[PDB]
Amino acid sequence: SVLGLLGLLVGYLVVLMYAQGEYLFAITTLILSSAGLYIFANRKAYAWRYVYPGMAGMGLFVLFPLVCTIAIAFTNYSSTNQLTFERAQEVLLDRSWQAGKTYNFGLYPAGDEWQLALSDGETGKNYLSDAFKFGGEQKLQLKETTAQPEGERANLRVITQNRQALSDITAILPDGNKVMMSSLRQFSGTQPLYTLDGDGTLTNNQSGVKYRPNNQIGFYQSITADEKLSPGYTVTTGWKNFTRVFTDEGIQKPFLAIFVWTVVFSLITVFLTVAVGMVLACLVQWEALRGKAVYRVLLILPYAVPSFISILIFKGLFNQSFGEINMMLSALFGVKPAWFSDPTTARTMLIIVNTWLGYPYMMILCMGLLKAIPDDLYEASAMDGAGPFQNFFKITLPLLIKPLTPLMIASFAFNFNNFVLIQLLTNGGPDRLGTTTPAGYTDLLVNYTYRIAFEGGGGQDFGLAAAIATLIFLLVGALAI
């Protein structure tokens, strides 16, 4: 019933995955599909039915783009080397040079059929084609005339409506050569810049220079019996990107240095957010407190505001010379801290902002997790004569840290790769001096690798960044063993 209809797509997609190329994606599409049919059909595998749809998402949208990203590392993927070879030549073959001169054209109705007219400005002569029907690639031989065509000239709107059929019409003069639509008002001779023969050798039509695909650098290059055509294509390079990480001194320089900041940043985040989160969660549920429910919503509010807009409003608030925080921080005290210029002051700001950002989540967590403690433990403590502080450190805290550990080691993992905070607030903070790659003081491992690949200027090597992305992750694979 449903086995056959879902079995229909296995062969409607599977077979077409083999066709039209795409060999890289045709493999996993069947492996994941055939496993889903085997599990959901016979009742021998029932436990996997609850697991499969979960891991299928994990595979397609987490595991694949990772394996694929590691494949990106073995190649020279760059701002220049960005497309496949068949997309590179597709671009190169598309571009065209103008040969012949321009003519002004007009569209004139003759019953149901149309009529074209060009006008040479050099000679002053006019040319007019026979009656034709719009549609398909057709050639029209124009004839010289002194008379006017019957029927009024078509307005722009009408010529725009028939633009597609008009672009395929290749008109030709009695004297000149082929001429095609160049705008809504003009016709000019536009021939393709290159031609591709039997072998993959592009030959120029204006200069006449031939070009062959150089698969060492990834470009079409000029050969003599050196020009480099620069749309560019992606080609494998092997261990060349991985070796650069172990070879370079200017890439390795901040690489170890920001690692320290990354871990230190996330440790201090976890510690302060848990502290603030827990202490408040204890206080909001405290019996003796009056407006518990009012306090509860107010302390949570920061979380009801999206992270990115908080960071952006903080960025403007933390401005050094101007900006409202230092405006009042110089009125009292008298200091205007260098929140962006100084490495430490910036690093401090990050933590202040992140603590603001991160405490509500820990509070909410502790609020629920706090209910796992039975009330009579504090009643037995009251008999023995313990104060509020004594209760917290001898009972509350040690009884919360165990169920909390996995959630805060998860918080360390989150804040380890907290990309959006750094990019939006500081984007690397103060610049790290004398580096071959773009690097900052507040950059995390995710930020540094991102700068290497995507940041305009100072190199855009997607491959090198992919090599470092793999090198991080595989070394985090030590957290397993």
Partner 1 sequence: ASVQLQNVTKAWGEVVVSKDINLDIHEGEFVVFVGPSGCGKSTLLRMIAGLETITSGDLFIGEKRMNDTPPAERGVGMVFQSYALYPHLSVAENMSFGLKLAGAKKEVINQRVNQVAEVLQLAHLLDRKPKALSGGQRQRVAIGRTLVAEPSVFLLDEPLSNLDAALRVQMRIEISRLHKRLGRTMIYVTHDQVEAMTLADKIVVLDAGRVAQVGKPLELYHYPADRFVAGFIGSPKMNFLPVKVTATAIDQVQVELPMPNRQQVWLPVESRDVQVGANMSLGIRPEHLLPSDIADVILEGEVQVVEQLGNETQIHIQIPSIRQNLVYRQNDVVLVEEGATFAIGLPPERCHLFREDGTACRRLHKEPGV
Partner 2 sequence: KIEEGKLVIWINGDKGYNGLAEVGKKFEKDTGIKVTVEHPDKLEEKFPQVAATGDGPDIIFWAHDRFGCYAQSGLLAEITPDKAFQDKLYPFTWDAVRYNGKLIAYPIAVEALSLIYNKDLLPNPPKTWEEIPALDKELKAKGKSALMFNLQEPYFTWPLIAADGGYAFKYENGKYDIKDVGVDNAGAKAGLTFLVDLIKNKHMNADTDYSIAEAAFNKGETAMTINGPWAWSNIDTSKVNYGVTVLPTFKGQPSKPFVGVLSAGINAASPNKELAKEFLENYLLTDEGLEAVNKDKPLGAVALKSYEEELAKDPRIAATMENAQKGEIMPNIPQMCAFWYAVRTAVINAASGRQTVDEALKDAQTRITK
Partner 3 sequence: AMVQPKSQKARLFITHLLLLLFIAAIMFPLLMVVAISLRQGNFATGSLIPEQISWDHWKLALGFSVEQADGRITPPPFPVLLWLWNSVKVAGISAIGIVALSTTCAYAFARMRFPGKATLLKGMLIFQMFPAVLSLVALYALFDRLGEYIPFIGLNTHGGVIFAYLGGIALHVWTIKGYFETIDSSLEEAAALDGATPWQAFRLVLLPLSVPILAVVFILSFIAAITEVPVASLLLRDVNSYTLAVGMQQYLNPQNYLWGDFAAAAVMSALPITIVFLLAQR
Ligand X SMILES: OC[C@H]1O[C@H](O[C@H]2[C@H](O)[C@@H](O)[C@@H](O)O[C@@H]2CO)[C@H](O)[C@@H](O)[C@@H]1O
Ligand Y SMILES: CCCCCC/C=C/CCCCCCCCCC(=O)O[C@H](COC(=O)CCCCCCCCCCCCCCC)COP(=O)(O)OC[C@@H](O)CO
Residues that bind ligand Y (CB under 6 A): 274-276, 279-280, 282-283, 286, 378, 388-389, 391-392
Contact between 428 and ligand X by CB under 6 A: the answer reads no
Shortest Å, Cβ 445 to ligand X: 16
Among partner 2, ligand Y, partner 1, none, partner that 231 touches (CB below 5 to 8 angstroms by kind): partner 2
Nearer to partner 3, 61 or 136 (CB): 61
Q: Contact letters (x/-) for partner 3, 400-439, by CB under 8 A? A: ------x---x--x--xx-xx---x---------------
Shortest Å, Cβ 191 to partner 3: 31
Q: Which stretch binds ligand X (CB under 6 A): 37-45, 86-94, 126-134, 351-359?
A: 351-359
Interface with partner 2 (CB under 8 A), residue from 72, 92, 128, 400: 92
Q: 341-345 long-range CB contacts below 8 Å, 24 or more apart? A: 341/430, 342/430, 343/429, 343/430, 343/441, 343/442
Q: Contact letters (x/-) for ligand X, 215-254, by CB under 6 A? A: ----------------------------------------
Is the separation of the CB atoms in 350 and 442 below 8 Å? yes
Q: Which of 162, 163, 110, 166 is nearest to 140 (CA)?
A: 166
Nearer to ligand X, 262 or 273 (CB): 273
Q: Which stretch binds partner 2 (CB under 8 A): 1-9, 38-46, 229-237, 417-425?
A: 229-237
Interface with partner 2 (CB under 8 A), residue from 434, 477, 479, 480: 434
Report the alpha-carbon distance of residue 34 to residue 56 in Å, rounded. Answer: 12
Nearer to partner 3, 198 or 406 (CB): 406
Q: Which two tokens stand for residue 362?
A: 């820990």
Contact between 82 and partner 2 by CB under 8 A: the answer reads yes
Nearer to partner 3, 406 or 456 (CB): 406
Contact between 415 and ligand X by CB under 6 A: the answer reads yes
Interface with partner 2 (CB under 8 A), residue from 34, 138, 161, 215: 161
Interface with ligand X (CB under 6 A), residue from 418, 442, 449, 460: 418
Nearer to partner 2, 358 or 430 (CB): 430
Place of tokens 């620069």: 230
Q: Quick one: three-class SS letters along the chain?
A: CCHHHHHHHCCCCHHHHHCCCCHHHHHHHHHHHHHHHHHHCCCCCCHHHCCHHHHHHHHHHHHHHHHHHHHHHCECCECCCCECHHHHHHHHHHCEEEEEEEEECEEEEECCEEEEEEECCCCCCEEECCCECCCCCEEEECEEECCCCCCCCCCHHHHHHCHHHHHCEEEECCCCCEEEECCCCEEEEEEECEEECCCCCEEECCCCCEEEEECCCCEEEECCCCCEECCCECCECCCHHHHHHHHCCCCHHHHHHHHHHHHHHHHHHHHHHHHHHHHHHHHHCCCCCCCHHHHHHHHHHHHHCCHHHHHHHHHHHCCCCCCHHHHHHHHCCCCCCCCCCCHHHHHHHHHHHHHHHHHHHHHHHHHHHHHHCCCHHHHHHHHHCCCHHHHHHHHHHHHHHHHHHHHHHHHHHHHHCCHHHHHHHCCCCCECCCCCCCCECCCCHHHHHHHHHHCCCCCCEHHHHHHHHHHHHHHHCCCCC
Is the separation of the CB atoms in 96 and 190 below 8 Å? yes
For 384, residues 6+ apart whose C-beta sits below 8 A from its C-beta are none
Contact between 357 and ligand X by CB under 6 A: the answer reads yes
Size of the site for partner 3 (CB under 8 A): 84
Site residues (CB under 8 A) for partner 2, limited to 384-423: none
Contact between 322 and partner 2 by CB under 8 A: the answer reads yes
Interface with partner 2 (CB under 8 A), residue from 123, 321, 333, 379: 321
Residues contributing to the site for partner 1 (CB under 8 A) = 374, 376-377, 379-386, 390, 394-395, 398-399, 402
Among partner 1, ligand X, partner 3, none, partner that 357 touches (CB below 5 to 8 angstroms by kind): ligand X
Shortest Å, Cβ 1 to partner 1: 22
Nearer to partner 3, 293 or 433 (CB): 293
Contact between 162 and ligand X by CB under 6 A: the answer reads no
Beta bridge partners of 159: none
Q: Contact letters (x/-) for partner 2, 166-205, by CB under 8 A? A: -x-------------xxxxxx-x-x---------------
Shortest Å, Cβ 403 to partner 1: 11
Contact between 266 and ligand X by CB under 6 A: the answer reads no
What residues make contact with partner 2 under the rule CB under 8 A? 79-80, 82-83, 91-92, 94-98, 101-102, 121, 156-157, 160-161, 163, 167, 181-186, 188, 190, 229-232, 319-322, 340-341, 430-431, 433-434, 454, 456-458
